[PDB]
Paper text:
[name] is an ATP-dependent 5′-3′ DNA helicase essential for bacterial Type IV-A1 [name] associated immunity. To provide immunity against plasmids, it is proposed that type IV-A systems bind DNA with an RNA-guided multi-protein Csf complex, and then recruit an accessory helicase called [name] to the DNA. It is supposed that, once loaded onto Csf-complex-bound DNA, [name] uses its ATP-dependent 5′-3′ helicase activity to silence transcription of nearby genes, mediating immunity. [name] contains an essential N-terminal domain predicted to bind DNA.
In an attempt to determine the structure of the N-terminal domain we solved the structure of a new crystal form of Pa [name] where overhang dsDNA substrates were included in our crystal conditions. To test our hypothesis, we screened crystals of Pa [name] grown in the presence of a 5’-overhang duplex DNA substrate. Orthorhombic crystals grew from precipitate after two weeks. We found that Pa [name] in the crystals had been proteolyzed corresponding to a ~12 kDa shift in molecular weight. The diffraction pattern corresponded to a unit cell of 67.04 Å x 84.01 Å x 97.619 Å and a P 21 21 21 space group, distinct from the unit cells of previously solved crystal structures. Matthews probability coefficient suggested a single solution of 1 [name] subunit in the unit cell with a solvent content of 29.75%. This was in the bottom quartile of solvent content for this resolution range, suggesting that [name] was tightly packed in this crystal morphology. The structure of Pa [name] revealed two helicase domains (HD1 and HD2) and two accessory domains (FeS-like and Arch domains), that aligned well (RMSD = 0.547 Å) with other models of Apo Pa [name]. Consistent with our Urea-PAGE analysis, no density for nucleic acid was observed. Additionally, no density was observed for the N-terminal domain of Pa [name], despite the tight crystal packing, which we had hoped would constrain the previously observed flexibility of the domain.
Author numbering: 107 to 229, 240 to 283, 288 to 308, 325 to 392, 396 to 725
The structure:
Amino acid sequence: ALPGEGAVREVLRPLLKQAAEKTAAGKIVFAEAATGTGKGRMIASLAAAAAIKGDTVVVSAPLAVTWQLVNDMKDIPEVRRVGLTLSLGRPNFISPQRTLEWAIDNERADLAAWIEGGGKPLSSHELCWLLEDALLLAEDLPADSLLLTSEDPADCPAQQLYVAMRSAGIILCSHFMLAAHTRMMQMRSLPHFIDTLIVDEAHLLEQAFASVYTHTLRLRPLMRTIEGLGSRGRKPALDALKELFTQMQVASARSTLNVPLSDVPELIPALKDTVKTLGALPTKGMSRDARSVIRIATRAANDALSGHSRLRIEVTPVHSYPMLLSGRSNLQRALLGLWNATGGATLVSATLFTTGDNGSLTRWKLEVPTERAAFLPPVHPAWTTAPVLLHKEFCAHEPDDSPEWATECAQTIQGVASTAQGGTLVLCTSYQNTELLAGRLGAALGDRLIVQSKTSSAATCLAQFKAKHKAGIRPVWLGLGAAWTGIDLSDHSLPDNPELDRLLSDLVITRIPVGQNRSLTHERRTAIGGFRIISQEAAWHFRQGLGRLVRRPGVTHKNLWVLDARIYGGAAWVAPFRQILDRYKK
């Protein structure tokens, strides 16, 4: 037996046994278990067994689920022997100054108010300024430019937090920490070699790598920084940034899209001049604020100049906030560098596969060597589907971003709000759909409707959903983005009475989530694999969206609605999404 195997639920013991075995054998184990099965105890036992063997063990997991992970591990007597610590590196926090400035710059009152409130945690010392919270507040946050770096002045609150939090057999870190560690490891805090790696919520890991390997040149705060400097080299740098912005206008007009360097050679002169000038103004007498701003800007411009990254131009015709994104479409090299510094690994997530035991997509995303992948059978008990009603109602008009489609879909959603026992989460695939559905549902569902938009984040909507449900209303949340994948809609006021959990009683998927992924990795994956990758990403996102209904066993009165007309229209390409839905009693 394994340390803490008695704490693990019986339904996970075969998964745990195979995972421990194959991980000790040097395999990258794929372990998918339904949310609410006690996966934290399984991970605790895996890490305890590995560290008991003398292995360096690292558990990479988001800080949202890290409190309970430490709680599950601190109960194992052998874990209390070999040591447990948290490597709360700088890739975990944001820069309060830069993040504030960004929030006012882009009119995000939620993010601005959270930064002004002290960055206190939405979910030793109290952890604040977390990157994951800011991402829940700005799904499109440019983490790269706002992450707390070692070049930040020590009077920064997040910098002081990192230094204080820098307070050993089992090391626990976040996905972003592990990605940044991989990056710094490959160049010419954490173990240089990972004997045993365990990744909770592995489906997020790839998104953490792409974020770490993305560079972001934001022109407005950079120019505003240089304006408040000495006149030594100010005029050339400002002229060069102006030339870069003009060239960005020209290059975005050149073709109307994630395009490479060779498609926009006009920026090449521009960025080289920019870097040159950003290195020519004297460091003598710059506060480390401006030092960070300018060095981050030079790094971003050089990564753009690399020719190995792909660029996004966001300029005046389309985006009031000028910005140059340069990300990698090929984290192949990065994640192989990771796995080569790893003896064995267990990837744990509620959603690892797409339409089956099929872990092809996820193995491609994390670039696991095919000779090390070990696909275990997924564990989904009966209670994930037993208290669920899959209703037969749906919108006849196909989802086409039209006024007519909104007019019909909103009637169906109105009926759902009419028969709902508690809250209702209506998942959407774009802000345009949210705005149309809000236009039709506003007057009737008043003081019940929550409209998630570019000005109302997923987490402010989450807090409001919880609040209006606590007040006895049956709130109806038109949500998107993290609402598909991130939110945990289980009533924390009823930890021991799941039969009374009515926080989310009716989930309504408006559209098949085709096209929710816009990352460079997925774009290249499509350019290689085709509609296979498109459909598999859709099915994966769809299973994630379904995973918001039943978060623990013993719940009752959960209703599921799928309004997409193509689901019931007899088209062949919608074949996977029906299979998943056939796991219910309609």
